[PDB]
Design an enzyme around this catalytic site. Structure first.
Site, short mmCIF file in Angstrom:
data_model
loop_
_atom_site.label_atom_id
_atom_site.label_comp_id
_atom_site.label_asym_id
_atom_site.label_seq_id
_atom_site.Cartn_x
_atom_site.Cartn_y
_atom_site.Cartn_z
N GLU D 60 16.59 33.64 5.84
CA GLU D 60 17.26 34.92 5.69
C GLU D 60 18.15 34.86 6.90
OE1 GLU D 60 16.49 39.01 5.37
OE2 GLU D 60 18.24 39.42 6.58
N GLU D 137 12.24 40.77 16.54
CA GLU D 137 12.66 41.68 15.21
C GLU D 137 11.26 42.53 15.45
OE1 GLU D 137 14.38 39.94 12.65
OE2 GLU D 137 16.61 39.86 13.33
#
Lengths: 423, 61, 105, 446, 51
Positions: D60, D137
């Protein structure tokens, strides 16, 4: 192979009330009562009254009690919610189509029957504290609040959230008076999706024939310029820098709208470098850590603010800001390609069409169109107006930002945030 | 039958705290019989002729 | 309009004087049993009525302690007796009975 | 005017076609001037292994950073410069890349999505760049207490199984995961039978097919045959994870019993019962008078800041319960009331509240399917999870069937006297002992 | 003062708790039967008449 669509039907009553509906043949219905009663209509003796008012939408009315509103609506899976900008409040109601009757009655009771009982109102005043608290945990909420506080002297200077000193202090009389002064016919627009225009009109002619506050969308907002600074330690400095733009509606305002898309608004591509964002690309060229820049563009009945909004580390604050501002200055000097302007147009147009896709979105457009314009103005003709923007006007938009008395708001560790003065 | 029976017990009798309690109460009556039987009879068998219950036939009427 | 409804009134004025909360500067609404419905209506009373109510009761419990009574002058005239609580109490019960009908469906 | 019944019939046939491929290509025409197109892959993280894990996420992250045909920077350039919105998500079961665009741009929209989903130029440069980003993240995701607790509840309930895994994977995988690993995942999982071209808005289905054939020509064309496996069933534990941290100002608890998952008719009925319990937030208008007895008592007695019921579905399983957030001296009372609610609904759901929940659910549903993006996502996902799109009328039918009995039954089946999974985070001294929680899962009076 | 408790919901909710309340008297009596060894009743029960 769906229905050939119905058109919107749009009606100006002689009292100046505006009705628009669309029969999308939808299982759900949306109804908004859009009032010219946003926060700009508070004065320095009653700041916050419209925010308490925003919260008071399920207090007892004349023939619908607090309990019934909650239970009545919840019983049908209905929603009732009230949204303020600096200009408007927007009382909108949603449910399944068979249930418009029960929801409409609740809606009119709120906007035209508020009892504002001492003890209910007193019970509610802690909620301005919670409500403010939640909202004011996006650094931007503060900034854009201070940004407005610094730009204007008056009217648009007022905050969407109640001053802390007024929490516990806004009265039932002040509430009552706010409704009387501001929730009149000349000031309202009744918009309905999945309802029929005959019914809307009946409801409007029966229940929304109110008048005798004031006329004018008008104290008239005096732009002034200045800067408000707030030492945080938040490690990231948020800052917005801004000059007076164009009032919403005017041709010039679309120049700014397009200039916003040249310099660059949000992202289009998840975790993208924003190759098409000039501001992002100019700042990146100088700056080697986490940042964000976006062109900022607010537009009101009788003014607007344009510029950009930076987020940087404390030490880079200035480097980011000066990089950002130059990059505008560079468009004012006339360095602007026609395919750039074209790109921003497709960005804007698509963004518009995108913005009106859902019922919540469409209804909002139509509501505010009604109050700012006294019209509906279809996509075909919005895009037309967008297309109508000259390369030159956009340059000139940017010229106007560069040369115009400025407004700044920033919060963080401000030790390397500039001063206007210093830009 | 030999696995899915604790299951069958649980569905029918043990889920509901009523039928649970009913089971323990219905189950206790049947247990009190079988125990005061068996154990008395165990206690019999360990004496076999020490007790007046066995002597009984000696001195008649 | 009436001889006889002036008599039901005279019976009422009798019982009022006879009850004799008046005698300790009390009003009829000072004397009400506090239940939840009552408790809330006291909550709902405006500042002054509340402050006046607390004083009346304070004065009365004081007399009641010292086994005394006011000067007849200072007693509460039947006509002068304001049902300051009535509308609040009625509104409370009204709200409760709504919740009660809703609880039925 | 139109009844609501009538109004459901009016909503068009979701048109489905199959490519010579496996690739299903599906569309709902509307009179919009604007569309959402994209690709729902039947890749997730249930699908990965302990060594694999966090690949799809790394994909992704790589997916928009440049193809064989359009190098690094330039895909962005094309999407942005046509005013379109490129976007992605992965779940434990689903990966989706989609574009919001102008309808007249559905050609190059599809052209792009095709190039993305096959020709991902996973440049070494970038996989390296991405690893720092993906780690950051992880560091920021550690601050969302809600994001954490749902990862923990997954980690404990599914305890043993691939479903117990996070979508991002552990720190160590992210740092070690190579290009080989990634292309292996890519070539295993991005095959046409396990992906749907989905579209909603201002388009004919005919064009969508023409473009499917054009740009998704030969994905699983000569492919498929070797080592495609089906998902294993995932064991639910029911079990507790308590990560105690008094430095955090509020507690997050998330409690769940085992769900039946995507396919099951019971989802409708459970969703009703859920709807009745509902959700709360301290910014909710008007508190004491809320219908929901949880939410009422919560608001009156200031028993929390937030709650939410849920029913997450996976294949053949899922997590059904609620999560909340509160003060350190609320954790018990909040637990009591939530549990006693479940039980009330198990034993003595009245007729009236069930009609409320039914309406609440209808209102959620219609309102959810608002505009190109939701409807497209629901086309794409549905075809993965049901093999159809289920038409709104069918849902109304399925909803309308449910009443108090259908509640007490379907609640008792899932909730009554069942071991929950508990996950807990932050200042959690007063989080009820597991035995005592599990005691809460039945009434002695019943 | 129990007028309050007469409505559709209340009858649904009584009708809900009926099989349970049924069984609770089954529990309570059979317990009293066993605990007093009620003679009069227990003669009916095969096995348990131990005389």
């Amino acid at each position: 192979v769906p229905p050939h669509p119905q058109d919107l039907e749009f009606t100006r009553l002689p009292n100046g009330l505006v009705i628009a509906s669309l029969e999308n043949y939808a299982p759900a219905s949306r109804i908004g009562l859009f009032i010219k009663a946003g926060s700009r209509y508070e004065n320095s003796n009653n700041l916050g009254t419209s925010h308490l008012l925003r919260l008071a939408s399920s207090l007892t009315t004349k023939g619908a009690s607090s309990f019934k509103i909650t239970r009545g609506i919840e019983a049908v899976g209905g929603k009732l919610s009230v949204t303020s900008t600096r200009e408007n409040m927007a009382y909108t109601v949603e449910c399944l189509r068979d249930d418009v009757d029960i929801l409409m009655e609740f809606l009119l009771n709120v906007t035209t029957a508020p009892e504002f009982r001492r003890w209910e109102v007193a019970a509610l005043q802690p909620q301005l504290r919670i409500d403010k608290a939640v909202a004011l945990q996006n650094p931007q909420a503060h900034v854009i609040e201070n940004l407005h506080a610094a730009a204007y002297r008056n009217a648009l200077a007022n905050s969407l959230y109640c001053p802390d000193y007024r929490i516990g202090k806004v009265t039932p009389v002040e509430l009552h008076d706010y409704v009387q002064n501001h929730f009149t016919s000349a000031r309202m627009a009744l918009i309905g999706l999945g309802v029929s225009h005959p019914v809307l009109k009946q409801v409007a002619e029966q229940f929304l024939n109110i008048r005798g506050g004031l006329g004018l969308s008008g104290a008239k907002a005096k732009y002034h310029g200045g800067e408000i600074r707030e030492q945080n330690g938040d490690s990231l400095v948020h800052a917005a820098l801004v000059a007076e733009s164009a009032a919403i509606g005017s041709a010039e305002a679309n120049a700014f709208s397009v200039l916003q898309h040249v310099l660059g608004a949000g992202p289009h591509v998840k975790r993208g470098s924003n190759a098409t964002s000039s501001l992002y690309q100019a700042v990146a060229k100088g700056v080697h850590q986490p940042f964000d820049v976006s062109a900022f563009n607010a537009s009101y009945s009788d003014s607007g603010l344009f510029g950009f909004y930076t987020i940087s580390q404390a030490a880079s604050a200035g480097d980011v800001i000066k990089a950002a501002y130059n990059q505008v200055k560079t468009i004012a000097q006339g360095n602007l390609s026609n395919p750039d302007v074209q790109a921003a147009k497709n960005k804007l147009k698509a963004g518009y069409l995108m913005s009106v896709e859902s019922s919540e979105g469409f209804l909002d457009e139509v509501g505010s169109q009604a109050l700012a314009a006294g019209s509906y103005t279809p996509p075909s003709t919005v895009l037309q107006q967008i297309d109508a923007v000259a390369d030159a006007d956009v340059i000139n938009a940017a010229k106007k930002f560069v040369s115009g008395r400025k407004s700044m708001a920033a919060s963080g560790n401000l030790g390397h945030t500039p001063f206007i003065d210093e830009l | 039958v030999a696995p899915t029976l604790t299951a069958r017990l649980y569905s029918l009798l043990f889920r509901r705290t009523s039928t649970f309690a009913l089971t323990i109460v219905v189950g206790a009556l049947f247990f009190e019989r079988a125990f005061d039987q068996g154990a008395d009879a165990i206690y019999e068998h360990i004496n076999e002729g020490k007790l007046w219950k066995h002597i009984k036939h000696k001195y008649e009427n | 309009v009436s001889a006889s409804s002036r008599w039901l009134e005279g019976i009422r004025k009798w019982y009022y004087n006879a009850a004799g909360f008046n005698k300790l500067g009390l009003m009829r609404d000072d004397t009400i049993h506090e239940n939840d419905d009552v408790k809330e209506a006291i909550r709902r009373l405006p500042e002054n009525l509340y402050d006046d109510r607390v004083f009346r009761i304070k004065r009365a419990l004081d007399l009641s302690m010292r086994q005394q009574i006011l000067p007849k002058e200072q007693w509460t005239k039947y006509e002068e007796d304001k049902s300051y609580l009535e509308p609040y109490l009625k509104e409370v019960i009204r709200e409760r009975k709504e919740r009660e009908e809703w609880a039925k469906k | 005017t139109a009844t609501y019944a009538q109004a459901l019939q009016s909503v068009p046939e979701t048109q489905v076609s199959q490519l010579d491929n496996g690739l299903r290509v599906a569309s709902e025409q509307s009179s919009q001037p604007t569309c959402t197109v994209g690709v729902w892959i039947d890749a997730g993280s249930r699908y990965e292994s302990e060594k694999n894990n966090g690949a799809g996420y790394f994909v992704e992250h790589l997916a928009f950073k440049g193809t064989k045909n359009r190098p690094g920077n330039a895909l962005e350039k094309e999407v942005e410069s046509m005013g379109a919105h490129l976007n992605a998500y992965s779940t434990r079961e689903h990966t989706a890349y989609y574009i919001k665009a102008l309808s007249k741009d559905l050609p190059k929209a599809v052209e792009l999505l095709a190039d993305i989903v096959q020709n991902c130029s996973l440049e070494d440069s970038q996989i390296e760049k991405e690893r720092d980003v993906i780690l950051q993240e992880l560091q920021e995701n550690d601050t969302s207490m809600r994001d954490v607790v749902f990862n923990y509840l997954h980690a404990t309930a599914f305890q043993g199984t691939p479903l117990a895994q996070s979508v991002e994977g552990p720190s160590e995988n992210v740092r070690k995961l190579s290009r080989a690993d990634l292309t292996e995942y890519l070539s295993r999982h991005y095959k046409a039978p396990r992906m749907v071209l989905a579209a909603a808005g201002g388009l004919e289905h005919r064009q969508l097919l023409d473009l499917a054939q054009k740009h998704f020509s030969g994905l699983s064309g000569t492919y498929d045959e070797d080592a495609v496996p089906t998902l294993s069933p995932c064991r639910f534990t029911g079990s507790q994870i308590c990560h105690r941290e008094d430095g955090l100002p509020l507690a997050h608890v998330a409690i769940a019993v085992e769900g039946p998952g995507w396919a099951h008719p019971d989802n409708v009925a459970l969703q009703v019962a859920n709807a009745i319990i509902g959700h709360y937030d301290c910014t909710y208008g008007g508190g004491a008078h809320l219908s929901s007895p949880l939410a009422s008592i919560a608001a009156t007695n200031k028993l929390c800041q937030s709650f939410q019921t849920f029913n997450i579905c996976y294949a053949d399983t899922g997590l059904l319960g609620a999560h909340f957030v509160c003060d350190h001296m609320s954790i018990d009372d909040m637990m009591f009331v939530l549990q006693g609610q479940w039980m009330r609904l198990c034993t003595s759901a009245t007729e009236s509240e069930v009609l409320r929940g039914k309406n609440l659910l209808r209102n959620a549903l219609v309102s959810h399917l608002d505009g190109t993006t939701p409807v497209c996502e629901d086309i794409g996902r549905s075809l993965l999870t049901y093999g159809r799109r289920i038409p709104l009328a069918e849902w109304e039918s399925r909803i309308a069937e449910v009443d108090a009995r259908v509640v007490r039954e379907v609640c008792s089946k899932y909730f009554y006297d069942q071991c929950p999974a508990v996950a807990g985070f932050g200042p959690i001294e007063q989080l009820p002992d597991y035995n005592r929680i599990r005691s809460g899962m039945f009434w002695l009076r019943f | 003062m129990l007028t309050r408790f007469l409505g559709p919901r209340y009858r649904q909710l009584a009708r809900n708790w009926v099989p349970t309340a049924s069984l609770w008297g089954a529990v309570g009596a059979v317990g009293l039967v066993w605990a007093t060894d009620w003679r009069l009743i227990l003669d009916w029960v095969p096995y348990i008449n131990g005389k």
